[PDB]
Amino acid sequence: LRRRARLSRLVSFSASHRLHSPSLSAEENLKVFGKCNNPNGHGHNYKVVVTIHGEIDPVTGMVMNLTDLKEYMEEAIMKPLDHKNLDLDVPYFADVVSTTENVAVYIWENLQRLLPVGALYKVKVYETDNNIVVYKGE
Amino acid sequence: LRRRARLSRLVSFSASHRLHSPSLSAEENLKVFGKCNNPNGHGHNYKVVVTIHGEIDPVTGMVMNLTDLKEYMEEAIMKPLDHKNLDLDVPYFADVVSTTENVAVYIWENLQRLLPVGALYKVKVYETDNNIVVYKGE
Ligand SMILES: [Zn+2]
């Protein structure tokens, strides 16, 4: 056979948002989200590590060419999210609270649409250095 | 998203074989394989369980239609192996010892050529009720 490995690439984007749910009242939203509920919003330099897994090619020695990984990530992460206000600039967040969990899910789905079946293994999102979410499609 | 499950189908086939390595001398072969080395062969009623996994379709409620899995197994297992001599009738075993392990591997590779990418989860082969091999592509 051929050896299997996991290849990861890290990228970062700047975006703003406000944690708010229309299903909760003005007071409930304040209790649940606190400072993150600030009506004018706030922002982050998000860090995303995308991991793909597969066999190491016997000729090129690559699981997937990083050039292609960069292209997929530009398309699924950078273009829709970089320098955007999450809740107002990206349709998906019109009715989905923009938590780190949901940003990870959003990124996972975007990549699935582009990558080869079974290529995607993990999406890790650092909202800040101390708040991290891992989503593996489960 | 959709719930994910494993769908298995059992099939049996009758075949004969002889455990014998070209790469070994007649006596080394005897010490290694014992009675399984009987010059004119011997046989088994092999039982094979093939498991596929994926999402349960929201309308049909099927991970894959058993009708289609049956057809896949007919092409991958029954046509080439049923009522055959492993070592003399199937090209693959010309230079590969027909152990239960190698039969599981052979079946795995056959199914992989036919099945949707990522569909195959496991191949289980019972050479007898007491001798079993599970192969998961590792
Ligand atoms: Zn925030």
Ligand SMILES: [Zn+2]
């Ligand atoms: Zn045998």
